[PDB]
Amino acid sequence: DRPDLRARVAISLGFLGGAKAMNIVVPFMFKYAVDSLNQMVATMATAVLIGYGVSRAGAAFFNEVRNAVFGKVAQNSIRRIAKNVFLHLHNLDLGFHLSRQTGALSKAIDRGTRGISFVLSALVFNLLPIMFEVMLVSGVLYYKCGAQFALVTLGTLGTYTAFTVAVTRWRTRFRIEMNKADNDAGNAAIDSLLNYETVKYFNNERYEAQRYDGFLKTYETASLKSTSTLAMLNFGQSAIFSVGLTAIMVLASQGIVAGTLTVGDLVMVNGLLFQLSLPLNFLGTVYRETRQALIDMNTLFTLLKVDTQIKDKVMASPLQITPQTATVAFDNVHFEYIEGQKVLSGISFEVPAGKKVAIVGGSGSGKSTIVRLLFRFYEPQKGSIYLAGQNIQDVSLESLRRAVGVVPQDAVLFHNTIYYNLLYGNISASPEEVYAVAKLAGLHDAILRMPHGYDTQVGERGLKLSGGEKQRVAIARAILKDPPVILYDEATSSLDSITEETILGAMKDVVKHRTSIFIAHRLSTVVDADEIIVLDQGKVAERGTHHGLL
Amino acid sequence: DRPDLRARVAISLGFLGGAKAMNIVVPFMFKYAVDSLNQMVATMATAVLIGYGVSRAGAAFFNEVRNAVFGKVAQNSIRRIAKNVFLHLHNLDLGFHLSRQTGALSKAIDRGTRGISFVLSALVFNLLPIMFEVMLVSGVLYYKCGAQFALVTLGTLGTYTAFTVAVTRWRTRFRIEMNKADNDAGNAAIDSLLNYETVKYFNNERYEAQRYDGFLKTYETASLKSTSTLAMLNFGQSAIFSVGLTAIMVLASQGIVAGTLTVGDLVMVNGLLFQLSLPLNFLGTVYRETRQALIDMNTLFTLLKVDTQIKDKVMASPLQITPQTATVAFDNVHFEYIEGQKVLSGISFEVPAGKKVAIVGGSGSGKSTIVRLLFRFYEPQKGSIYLAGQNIQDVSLESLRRAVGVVPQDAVLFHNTIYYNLLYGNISASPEEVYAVAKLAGLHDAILRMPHGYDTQVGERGLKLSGGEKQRVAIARAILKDPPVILYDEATSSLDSITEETILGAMKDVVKHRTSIFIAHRLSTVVDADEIIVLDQGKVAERGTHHGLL
Ligand SMILES: Nc1ncnc2c1ncn2[C@@H]1O[C@H](COP(=O)(O)OP(=O)(O)NP(=O)(O)O)[C@@H](O)[C@H]1O
Ligand SMILES: Nc1ncnc2c1ncn2[C@@H]1O[C@H](COP(=O)(O)OP(=O)(O)NP(=O)(O)O)[C@@H](O)[C@H]1O
Ligand SMILES: [Mg+2]
Ligand SMILES: [Mg+2]
């Protein structure tokens, strides 16, 4: 609906048309020059030669301005689809991204974008202009000279395309065979290199060389066959074009002898047919990978269509929240991660406002399931969840996400500065608040002990950090978010004792005048809970204070 | 020194020359046809047109037969260098392959071979033929018409190549910028995908999209600049060729007006210059990656030149060996794997013929160093090694390798059938001996319990196997080799007890009437040794039988 893109497309098509027109005009110019020189007074011939030169220069200019304009508009379009698909991809369920246990999604999306761009560019720069050229050639040859010339040029193009189509598959089979042979040789080389200790242990240094030589023959025959068939295809194309040129020139000469049309008219049709024939090898060399581009586009489309999982509901009502009330509770919670495997069943808690509640389990069965469920990653098909009297599934999503904050079991940090990771908790927060939160988290000492401090580079490719710093960063982010409800899922892996008391004190500071749900495996960390819940074989069996022991 | 390759090269060059000659003849043919039709009787014109067609067809045929012949000879050469470099690579020291802790060597060697082939093919198919074309054009234009035509065509080529060289670098800088921007965008996408849990934890789903959009601009500007500069370069080329054609045709017309040369001579020089100009864009599009091919070739050459490490000595005397004698011993052995770190020092053993000697150490300091040294992987610069009174360093290498057999600490198996791995111990061994050895090794029961048996596929990509089967395979290979001296370096990792007694019985069968050096960490495995050697802090301190305790 943007007129700018329509204007650019129209300009590109008009430039294509003008370019084809000038390409058609050029042989007319040459023929007029030849006739003028045959008649002889040289001023007219010089003018026609200058016209020939400027016409072909203008044709090239038109081609290239069309190329530049369409490149700009297409690349802008690629920027729009890529930006949209990125946001769309970051909306699916957690299960899909857990299944996609690789970073191949970025490669897939970029490959699809490049493939779409390549397909569009190849189509608009080859298919339409070549068909337009053929139509203009046929029309001008039929009107200027006769029907026979148009018929013979159409026949020449028909036999050329038929031959190319026939040879393409008979060559791609050999290409596939060579590719498989090369892969086999590479795998054999990998195995021989890997078994080098055993190779040295025995006398087998020449046997591996002989095997590699045999594999080199297996690749050799296919390579030779592919080269030979490529040469044969090129011969077919060139000979077809030669026969076409010879026939058209013979027809022009036969017309000349009768005196129907003037001498010097065969050279124009020769040049015109040849300039028609020029781009048909560029056509093939770009069609070579169009199938792969289309395959990549299909893969991207399928990945976009895996988006059938949508946890968002309709009628997004607002969430009424306040520091008081907000009594998180359950009602007959049953849920299964694995189809038919009751990981969690019969769970129902009761957390009053301002009270710290800690849940403790064994090796683990649903300990992190509470964190997953309360943040609305999965739907508890049985029972319900209550938050200030509001069901999780009956309220607008991202507002619920903003209401409750979580300190995760694990931690991942963006490949940026520490200050950016701290600020990630609240984008519109003042830097002074960020510094105060970081100081409150008991991390500023490690920041000043860092090689740089706030601006030090931390990431996967940055300097490595232990678990304690990541826990401090997560706690500080939770503080910066400032949620009325906090879910601290402390990591199962232990750390230094002093760090444990520091994080315990930090969490005690967090709990002040708010609701906190603690997950831990150490009794000393949960002695301060108002009520403690014990999880056994996926069920709740024990509730109460620390006086219940274990 | 093979006349076949010289004959093929001569045939290819002769076909190239004939092809260029025919390409030169074609415009002469067209000019003769034009003059014949201008004079008019049509039989001569028809004959000249037929000659034009057959001449251009023959020129294409000559090009392509040259292409096929040189492809064959070059690919054969590639097969020779690859086969030689594989054998040369499997001759270096163990340290180089330990340092090369990747399978990238095969990729490097294949990439280098393809790069050498590509460089040779591009050179022989573009540089020489184009220079020959230019020389023939200049000569024929100077002799047939005059010096001015040759001068102007040489000037046109000079300005074309100067413009292309000038624009190449100014475009490759933009190419580098675009490549870096694309890499940055991909890395940002990787980070955003990896931090998806933290993205969902907060409200930051649109912020990542905005950042990706900014990166898309950073890539966008470079892409647009590269497309624009490519279009500008193409305009420069086409306009230069247009000016050249216009100038040459104007000169031909000026010559025609004076009557010095006949009408219809401008079209021949036009077509001749254009067919000269035809391949100069193929030239650039193949030169695009010649630098990368040369870089790969340089990397392969450097890797071949890392071969300065050569443990082989001169004056390879034969090794006198017999089941008797062969008393392996040391004399003040000191060696350091890490420069300045005395891993092994002051080691001197004494193993009489037919006696089983076991060495036992702590966590490990030089336990496998004995296995490494006796098989001549490293040189003990201090002291000497005695084997039947023959120094290891003063005898031919691979015969010493064949004399002594080793059961390794670890094990690796070729990605082939079990029968092939068993036969790898002795290539020229009868299959019946292989079956008898396998049965003696206590493995045929597991073979018949296997899904297939002898022909089952076992490898990295095959079915996985535990350590016990690998140990049985190694023992059976050692039996098939049948060495007078055996060094059994039993793995530090333990296995099933019953498997331990079975392998102990197998080793006891091995020791019969031969010399065996055992390495183990279990006292029960070494109680049967004639004398036991205890290694402490890299030195020998305790020697004797089992009565010495520990
Ligand atoms: N995406 C998933 N699909 C299926 N099962 C899952 C998935 N994620 C986790 N589980 C299972 O959920 C069970 C309980 O998980 P969790 O709540 O983390 O307790 P835990 O991991 O066993 N104890 P802890 O290590 O302290 O968290 C585990 O045994 C997992 O096998
Ligand atoms: N290629 C090498 N370069 C440098 N140091 C090495 C190399 N190989 C081994 N070492 C070191 O030398 C020591 C001797 O290793 P080795 O002779 O295998 O006994 P071990 O590894 O100590 N114990 P075990 O597991 O019973 O073999 C090891 O501790 C290694 O760290
Ligand atoms: Mg957990
Ligand atoms: Mg060892």
UniProtKB/Swiss-Prot annotation, chains A, B:
Catalysed reactions, semicolon-separated: (glutathione)4[2Fe(III)-2S] cluster(in) + ATP + H2O = (glutathione)4[2Fe(III)-2S] cluster(out) + ADP + phosphate + H(+)
Positions annotated to bind ATP: 337, 361-372
Modified residues (N6-acetyllysine): 72, 107
Membrane association type: Multi-pass membrane protein
In-chain residues carrying the UniProt-annotated modification Phosphotyrosine: 196
Disulfide bonds: none
ABC transporter domain mapped to chain residues: 328-550
Principal location: mitochondrion
DNA damage is among the record's keywords: no
Modified residues annotated as Phosphothreonine in this record: 198
Membrane-crossing segments per the record: 10-30, 42-62, 116-136, 147-167, 239-259, 266-286
GO biological process, one term: transmembrane transport
Mitochondrial intermembrane side stretches: 137-146, 260-265
Modified-residue entries (Phosphoserine), positions: 192
Keywords: Acetylation, ATP-binding, Disease variant, Membrane, Mitochondrion, Mitochondrion inner membrane, Nucleotide-binding, Phosphoprotein, Transit peptide, Transmembrane, Transmembrane helix, Transport
GO MF: ABC-type iron-sulfur cluster transporter activity; ATP binding; ATP hydrolysis activity; ATPase-coupled transmembrane transporter activity; heme transmembrane transporter activity; identical protein binding; protein homodimerization activity
UniProt binding sites for glutathione: 171-175, 234-237, 284
Keyword Iron-sulfur belongs to the record: no
Spans within the Mitochondrial matrix topological domain: 63-115, 168-238, 287-550
Disease per UniProt entry: Spinocerebellar ataxia, X-linked 6, with or without sideroblastic anemia: An X-linked recessive disorder characterized by an infantile to early childhood onset of non-progressive cerebellar ataxia and mild anemia, with hypochromia and microcytosis.
Family classification: Belongs to the ABC transporter superfamily. ABCB family. Heavy Metal importer (TC 3.A.1.210) subfamily.
Oligomer status and interactors: Homodimer or heterodimer. Interacts with C10orf88/PAAT. Forms a complex with ABCB10 and FECH, where a dimeric FECH bridges ABCB7 and ABCB10 homodimers; this complex may be required for cellular iron homeostasis, mitochondrial function and heme biosynthesis. Interacts with FECH. Interacts with ATP5F1A. Interacts with COX4I1; this interaction allows the regulation of cellular iron homeostasis and cellular reactive oxygen species (ROS) levels in cardiomyocytes.
Protein's UniProt name: Iron-sulfur clusters transporter ABCB7, mitochondrial
Organism: Homo sapiens
Section of the entire sequence shown: 132 to 694 of 752
